[PDB]
């Protein structure tokens, strides 16, 4: 009985109070070692026009979420795996009179083919580059979480 509506983007009807989204972290091997991807929103104003990992609307089904979750990612990079995707914890930030629910997702290319492609709305930075990057707390929290289950060690 999921009450409330998801995706206040459309015609302003429901309050932001109920806002859920599923963000994922895309990483790929490089000369240095491994760099992640960071996209910026066209929005302008408060918490608008900032850099942060790509995300998609919230899905009730553990499958629908991952499915669409990738769709977006592809829009930026392109070829995105499926099995490599795995949910790693979550990030829920409580605002003054609002409640946001971000789903932390990790996705890295063990040894698959690179993307060597990206639109003018997405930039490929490193792990140390992201931090210094202007990112909203919410997002900054998703990273530390994604780092958890992630290591170079064999697999």
């Amino acid at each position: 009985g999921s009450s409330g509506s998801s995706g206040p983007r459309k015609a302003s009807r429901k309050p932001p109070r109920e806002e859920s989204s599923a963000t994922c972290v895309l990483e790929q091997p490089g000369a240095l070692g491994a760099q992640i991807l960071l996209v910026q929103r066209p929005n302008s104003g408060l918490l608008a026009g900032l850099w942060e990992f790509p995300s998609v609307t919230w899905e009730p089904s553990e499958q629908l979420q991952r499915k669409a979750l990738l769709q977006e990612l592809q829009r930026w990079a392109g070829p995105l795996p499926a099995t490599h995707l795995r949910h790693l914890g979550e990030v829920v930030h409580t605002f003054s009179h609002i409640k946001l629910t971000y789903q932390v997702y990790g996705l890295a290319l063990e040894g698959q083919t690179p993307v060597t492609t990206v639109p003018p709305g997405a930039r490929w930075l490193t792990q140390e580059e992201f931090h210094t990057a202007a990112v909203s707390t919410a997002m900054k929290k998703v990273f530390r979480v994604y780092q958890g289950q992630s290591g170079p060690s064999s697999g």
Side-chain angles (χ1 to χ4, degrees):
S2 276
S3 180
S5 287
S6 307
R9 303 287 163 174
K10 68 152 183 155
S12 288
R13 282 277 74 201
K14 288 280 186 199
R17 296 207 187 188
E18 40 269 292
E19 275 193 41
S20 313
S21 307
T23 180
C24 181
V25 168
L26 169 59
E27 168 196 79
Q28 75 160 280
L32 309 168
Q35 61 268 131
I36 40 168
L37 160 81
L38 205 70
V39 308
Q40 90 194 128
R41 285 87 166 73
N43 298 79
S44 46
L46 273 169
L47 276 170
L50 273 288
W51 297 87
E52 46 203 79
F53 315 133
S55 79
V56 311
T57 171
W58 176 84
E59 287 283 35
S61 200
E62 208 183 56
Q63 170 158 335
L64 274 42
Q65 207 325 269
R66 291 171 77 186
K67 281 202 309 184
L69 169 56
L70 290 177
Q71 282 205 241
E72 173 74 46
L73 276 169
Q74 303 160 51
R75 302 181 77 198
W76 307 106
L80 273 294
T83 304
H84 288 212
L85 185 55
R86 274 191 193 170
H87 158 255
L88 328 182
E90 89 204 40
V91 165
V92 167
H93 189 88
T94 30
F95 288 89
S96 275
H97 88 124
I98 288 151
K99 210 271 210 158
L100 271 283
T101 291
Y102 285 81
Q103 301 283 262
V104 183
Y105 273 113
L107 192 298
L109 293 162
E110 208 48 84
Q112 276 274 268
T113 60
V115 58
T116 76
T117 300
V118 75
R123 89 183 283 86
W124 276 89
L125 47 73
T126 80
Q127 287 183 112
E128 63 179 24
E129 276 197 286
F130 159 84
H131 271 298
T132 63
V135 210
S136 90
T137 293
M139 317 309 304
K140 292 208 88 271
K141 287 160 81 70
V142 177
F143 174 79
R144 88 189 276 174
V145 185
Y146 152 74
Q147 292 193 286
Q149 286 195 36
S150 191
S153 183
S154 57

